[PDB]
RNA sequence: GUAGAGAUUCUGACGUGCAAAUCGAUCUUCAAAUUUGGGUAUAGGGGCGAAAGACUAAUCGAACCAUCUAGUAGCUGGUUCC
RNA sequence: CAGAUCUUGGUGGAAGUAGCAAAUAUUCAAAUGAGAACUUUGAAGACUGAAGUGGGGAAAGGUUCCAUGUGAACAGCAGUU
């Protein structure tokens, strides 16, 4: 399946890049048929699709 | 569709044939010289080497700039190659010739590849961009192939 | 103008690959018939080098009297197994081989050179001709009888004892080796007594002896001229290229002259190295084989970690001086010098004081195990 | 008998000592394949993501010189006669031991 | 000295190229006689020119397009069966 | 018509040859599919490093934007894109 869409849709409406937007991959064949912002933000609530956190980046040695 | 040999028994013959195949028709023809006169089975079992760099496809007639390799032996020549996009083609079109064979009838233990035969198919051309705003052509050189099997 | 010799030899042309790896005799010393019956040849296998350190005897010289240090290339010699003999008759044109009498049996490993893959093979190489030695003995005896009767040259075929040499091969080397000595009748009946009979190196060299070292040498591929023939590089602003020719013709002739210097192969080839005096003949059946009289801590000529490439040489070693032939490991040539030597480093008896045994595998600086023990004391591992 | 499990010790040192820096990360994966080709005698070998995180840990440059593999011969969903390998890593103190056998 | 604007040398790469002028290193200038967008004016024996006969749509010691024009050529090539 | 560096068109040897090498770099598993090195997902390793390979505009282009399908031609290799 192709989910260029559903990844443009995520990000959208998660507020972040496509590089945060993750989909689980055990659940393919359900994100391939959201086809909608009302469906994106449903796979959200479900879990489906999340945001990932931001790579780290500390100010330990900074400070120090 | 006319043949250009009928070397064989029509009742106990099969053919195929394919037109403007979009494979080579230098490499088309040095496996169709390769695989003429030897029997189905060993024709399937040869291609099938080729396919897996066990055995290789001698180059006879263009054989400018082909490297060599000990694979040629067999054949008495320095010169061969594995041409797998011709070597598909010729599979395909034997397994045609085997099932029209099995729809005739043939006994399918004495097929021997009577006769196979390449032919230029007309070139489809596309464009290269050369140094100082030249264009140039950039032709394809696609291939008919036709295969005649019969019984020994 | 500005002239300068021209850069390589002509002599060794064509620079191809050699046809063959063993390295074969062009030219075996002139016969003589009073000298009693003698080998000509033998083969061995280059185990590696090392250097030695001998007081030179040479009256005049700045250093008489004096250490000097000299490098060695110890060449494993194995006694060689004598399974048969071929006699060449002298015809107008040439020497021509008139038949071949082979032993009654034969060794896997000479059997082995005659075959591709002696596993895969059945074996049977010289089964008819066994049948044939012990039918009646009357065919053999024949056979001896016309090479006595007629041919004025006799060789006798050897091949090398590869089984007992770390060398990963199992094929043995053969080699026709001309027999010198009085009279036809004595060379057979020597070659006949000397069937699957073991020849050593001492009785075919002695110590101080100049002989000639033939072989083939370490390939080096396909090279440019400037390192196939030492030509000058090109300028820095040479376009296309410096490490060339500038100039390989002139028109009229309008081709390319057999005598420019052209990239091709430059490694792999025959060659034959002549004055190599023998400094030491060892034995493999003693523990001094590494030992002088200046030195004699029971030490064997083999460094630290064994030989690099090679191995343990257990067997008997030539310690010819200086460089020979080909790489490590690989079969060389021993032949009886074609000249007469009368020079003072020709006659001059050598007597090593010290040979190195400490390891070629790096900065060696133990020559023995026990050295290493008492220098390092206990270490970690050592103790426990 | 044909689905047998074995750890092995692949010394990925002497086979990466001549390897482009750009390459060795994926040549250390086909060496790996090889490797598990060759003592398996199967075509198919199916390599584990942990697996190749482990051998990409340290970069495209840098690959352990010595890795614990578990090679383990299984049936596919396929036909019943064809036989695969799966690659795996083993986490160990010392990586310098010898072949053994998993039950 | 960065951005920007240029192009000294390697007479480097390339030189049927990525490119009918480019690429790399190096180099010149970098707060003014600076660089530049858009609008507008100057048109071919004319314009414009810190001046090289330079630029004026890859065309410049007189641009391009069509016509006179199938211009003329003591010059070159060719000029068809027995 | 045998020529005119003739005109138009077609087709050769060179030749399966020169070549498809700037811009650091890809790997594992799964899904789809007849077919996966190029599609999608997950994981890992990297790059642009804010005078960016980010987010927008002016000129210019004109539907290239989006969704759903196709893989005949093009994407100088491939193609499910």
Redesign the pocket.
């Given at each position: 399946?192709?989910?260029?869409?559903?990844?443009?849709?995520a990000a959208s409406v998660l507020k972040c890049?496509?590089?945060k937007?993750?989909?689980?991959?055990?659940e393919?064949?359900e994100?391939?048929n959201a086809?909608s912002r009302q469906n994106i933000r449903k796979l959200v609530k479900d879990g489906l699709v999340i945001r990932?956190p931001n790579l780290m980046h500390s100010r330990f040695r900074i400070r120090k | 569709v006319r043949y250009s040999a009928s070397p064989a028994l029509e009742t106990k013959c099969a053919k195929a044939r394919g037109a403007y195949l979009?494979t080579?028709?230098?490499?088309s023809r040095e496996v169709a010289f390769t695989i003429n006169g030897m029997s189905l089975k060993k024709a399937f079992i040869f291609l099938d080497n080729v396919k897996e760099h066990k055995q290789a496809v001698p180059?006879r007639?263009?054989?400018?700039?082909?490297?060599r390799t000990a694979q040629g032996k067999e054949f008495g020549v320095t010169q061969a190659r594995w041409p797998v996009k011709s070597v598909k083609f010729f599979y395909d079109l034997l397994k045609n010739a085997e099932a029209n064979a099995e729809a005739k009838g043939l006994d399918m233990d004495k097929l021997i590849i009577k006769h196979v035969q390449v032919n230029?198919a007309?070139?489809?051309?596309?464009?290269?961009?050369?140094?100082?705003?030249?264009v140039?052509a950039?032709?394809?050189?696609p291939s008919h192939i036709e295969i005649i099997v019969a019984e020994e | 103008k500005f002239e300068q010799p021209r850069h390589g030899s002509l002599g060794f042309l064509p620079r191809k690959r050699a046809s063959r790896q063993r390295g074969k005799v062009k030219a075996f010393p002139k016969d003589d018939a009073s000298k009693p019956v003698h080998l000509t040849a033998f083969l061995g296998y280059k185990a590696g080098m090392t250097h030695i350190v001998r007081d030179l005897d040479r009256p005049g010289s700045k250093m008489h009297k004096r250490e000097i240090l000299e490098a060695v290339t110890v060449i494993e010699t194995p006694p060689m197994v004598v399974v048969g003999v071929v006699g060449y008759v002298e015809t107008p044109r040439g020497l021509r081989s008139l038949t071949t009498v082979w032993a009654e049996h034969l060794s896997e490993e000479v059997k082995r050179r005659f075959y591709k893959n002696w596993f895969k093979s059945k074996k049977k190489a010289f089964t008819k001709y066994a049948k044939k030695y012990a039918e009646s003995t009357q065919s053999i005896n024949r056979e001896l009888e016309r090479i006595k009767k007629y041919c004025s040259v006799v060789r006798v075929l050897a091949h090398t004892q590869i089984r007992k040499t770390p060398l990963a091969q199992k094929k043995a080397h053969l080699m026709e080796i001309q027999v010198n000595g009085g009279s036809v009748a004595d060379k057979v009946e020597w070659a006949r007594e000397h069937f699957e009979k073991t020849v050593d190196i001492k009785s075919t060299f002695e110590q101080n002896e100049m002989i000639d070292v033939i072989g083939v040498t370490r390939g080096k591929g396909n090279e440019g001229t400037t390192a196939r023939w030492g030509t000058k590089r090109l300028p820095?602003?040479t376009?296309?290229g410096l490490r060339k020719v500038a100039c390989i013709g002139a028109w009229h002739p309008a081709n390319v002259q057999w005598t420019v210097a052209r990239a091709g192969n430059a490694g792999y080839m025959h060659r034959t190295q002549l004055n190599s005096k023998i400094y030491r003949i060892g034995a493999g059946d003693d523990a001094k084989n590494a030992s002088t009289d200046f030195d004699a801590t029971e030490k064997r000529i083999t460094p630290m970690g064994g030989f690099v490439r090679y191995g343990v040489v257990e067997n008997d070693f030539v310690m010819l001086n200086g460089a020979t032939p080909g790489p490590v490991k690989r079969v060389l040539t021993l032949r009886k010098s074609l000249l007469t030597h009368t020079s003072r480093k020709a006659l001059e008896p050598v007597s090593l004081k010290w040979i190195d045994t400490a390891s070629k595998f790096g900065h060696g600086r133990f020559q023995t195990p026990a050295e290493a023990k008492q220098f390092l004391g206990t270490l970690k591992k050592d103790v426990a | 008998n044909q689905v047998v499990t074995r750890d092995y010790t692949i010394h990925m040192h002497k086979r990466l000592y001549g390897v482009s820096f750009?390459?060795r990360?994926?040549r250390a994966?086909?060496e790996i394949?090889a490797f598990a080709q060759k003592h398996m005698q199967t075509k198919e070998?199916?390599?584990?993501?942990?697996?190749?995180?482990e051998?990409?840990?340290?970069?495209?440059?840098n690959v352990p010189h010595r890795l614990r593999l578990r090679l383990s011969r299984k049936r596919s969903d396929e036909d019943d006669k064809a036989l695969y390998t799966y690659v795996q890593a083993v986490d160990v103190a010392n990586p310098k031991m010898e072949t053994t056998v998993v039950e």
């Open positions: 399946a192709n989910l260029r869409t559903q990844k443009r849709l890049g496509k590089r937007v993750w989909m689980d991959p055990n393919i064949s994100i391939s086809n990932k | 979009r080579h028709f230098k490499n180059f007639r263009f054989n400018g700039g082909v490297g230029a007309p070139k489809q051309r596309r464009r290269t961009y050369r140094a100082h705003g030249r140039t950039y032709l394809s050189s | 820095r602003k376009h296309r | 750009k390459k990360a994926p994966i086909k394949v070998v199916r390599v584990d993501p942990s697996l190749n995180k051998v990409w840990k340290r970069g495209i440059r």
